[PDB]
Amino acid sequence: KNPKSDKFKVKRFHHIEFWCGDATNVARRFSWGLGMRFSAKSDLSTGNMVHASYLLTSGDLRFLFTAPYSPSLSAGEIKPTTTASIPSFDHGSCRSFFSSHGLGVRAVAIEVEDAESAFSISVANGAIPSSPPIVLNEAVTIAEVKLYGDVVLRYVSYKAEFLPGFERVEDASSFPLDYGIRRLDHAVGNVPELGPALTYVAGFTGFHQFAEFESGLNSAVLASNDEMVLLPINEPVHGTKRKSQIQTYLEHNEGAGLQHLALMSEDIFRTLREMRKRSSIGGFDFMPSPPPTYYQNLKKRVGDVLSDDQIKECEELGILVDRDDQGTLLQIFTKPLGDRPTIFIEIIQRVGCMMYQSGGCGGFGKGNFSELFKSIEEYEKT
């Protein structure tokens, strides 16, 4: 059931913004680890005395990395005279965010038809304002409302290239890395209580519950009208044999925040070969692979969608496979991206649901939890 109740016109995910201590080192690490190209910058060299911001791109995926300079560089400025290219930025907010949470996502940005209308309608329907709409060079409008914890939902609308005040990076410094990642599929939050969090966000967006088809979490997914903007939210399940990773997140993050970003690949085998080659030379590590009993039991449930050769290839790369009623999901998870056991990345590819491909085709892998438990027990039973 898709009631199509968006209170304003939503298009697609636009970018994800990380708040960092040093944007340069995080951006370079992420670029090499994920195969994303340096695309634009806003920093001292472009006249920004407030923050250093670097944009990486792969396909339509946009990762922005931002860190504050010394406030002394901009002490004479006021908001009307700021050299910040992101006018919602605040030194104190950014340092407080990073001290509290460590490296993590500050903004989940979606493109809308009219960011001022989106902000107004959102706030009229219960959204906590974070930064009011501001028109940049008469060309782009940006506004922010609270999503959960200290994460904001950022509305961006274009009249008619990332943001005014950003510069294309020179091709010499812009190496065309590409491991196959193409777009953000979903962005997942961890909260202490799912109920109030769902009611709040669905209250001000009009996003609807996206239907799914006992290991530490209850979850629900909010979706835009065409189900291309997907925002799952998890809460912990307490009193379990194994401690909930949702609870671990909330402890180490100092509360609610963004848990994982799922990045769609146009070829998950190529992406995983390329990322795994780089795991121990500056890139990203992956969670421990499932036991081979998991891949022994895969032919019995997706053997009509994947050949034995491609099931073998999943076993090499440690890829997980789940089946919906409409499509199939290939997925794998990185270890945490930074010092804390908080944010991580998921790589995914979906097969099925062609009309273009409809959103959330194959679900989110909820079945892979019990399937991993069963497979682990069978391997250890042997």
Question: In this chain, which of 100, 245, 279, 357 binds ligand WI9, going by CB under 6 A?
Answer: 245
**Closest CB to a copy of itself among residues 73, 136:** 73
Whether 6 contacts 143, CB under 8 Å: no
| Rounded-to-integer distance, Cα 317 and Cα 71, Å | 46
Question: Where in the chain does DSSP place strands (E)?
Answer: 10-19, 37-42, 51-58, 61-68, 104-112, 129-136, 140-148, 151-158, 167-168, 181-190, 208-210, 217-223, 230-236, 257-265, 320-323, 327-333, 344-352
Q: Is 17 assigned a ligand-binding role in the annotation?
A: no
Q: Which of these segments, 7-15, 132-140, 153-161, 345-353, binds Co ion (CB under 5 A)?
A: 345-353
333 binds ligand WI9 (CB under 6 A): yes
Question: In this chain, which of 294, 346, 362, 375 binds Co ion, going by CB under 5 A?
Answer: 346
Q: Is 346 assigned a ligand-binding role in the annotation?
A: yes
| Rounded-to-integer distance, Cα 68 and Cα 94, Å | 7
- Side-chain half-sphere of 318: how many Cα atoms within 13 Å? 16
Q: How far is the CB of 273 from a copy of itself (least distance, A)?
A: 17
CB atoms within 10 A of CB 229: 26
Name beta bridge partners: 144: 131, 154
Binding site partner of 29, from Co ion, ligand WI9, a copy of itself, none, Cβ cut-off 5-8 A by kind:
a copy of itself
3-state helix, strand, coil in the chain (%, to 5): 30, 35, 40
**Burial of 34 by CB count in 10 Å (0-12 exposed, 13-18 middle, 19+ buried)?**
buried
Residue ranges in 201-220 that form contacts with ligand WI9 under rule CB under 6 A = 219
Q: How far is the CB of 45 from a copy of itself (least distance, A)?
A: 10
275 binds ligand WI9 (CB under 6 A): no
CB neighbours of 118 closer than 8 A, spacing ≥ 6? Answer: 8, 112, 143, 155, 157
Q: Which of these segments, 109-117, 235-243, 280-288, 355-363, binds a copy of itself (CB under 8 A)?
A: 280-288
333 binds a copy of itself (CB under 8 A): no
Q: Which of these segments, 26-34, 105-113, 201-209, 354-362, binds a copy of itself (CB under 8 A)?
A: 26-34
Residue count (the chain):
382
CA dist 56 → 36, 171, 357 (Å) = 6, 13, 25
**Closest CB to ligand WI9 among residues 96, 370:** 370
**Closest CB to ligand WI9 among residues 71, 195:** 195
273 binds a copy of itself (CB under 8 A): no
Q: Is 186 assigned a ligand-binding role in the annotation?
A: yes
Question: In this chain, which of 262, 320, 321, 361 binds Co ion, going by CB under 5 A?
Answer: 262
Binding site: what residues are annotated?
A: 186, 260, 346
Q: Which residues bind a copy of itself (CB under 8 A)?
A: 20-26, 28-33, 38, 43-44, 52, 67, 69-70, 72-73, 95, 98-100, 102-103, 172-175, 177, 251-252, 254, 280-283, 285, 337-341
Binding site for Fe cation: what residues are annotated?
A: 186, 260, 346
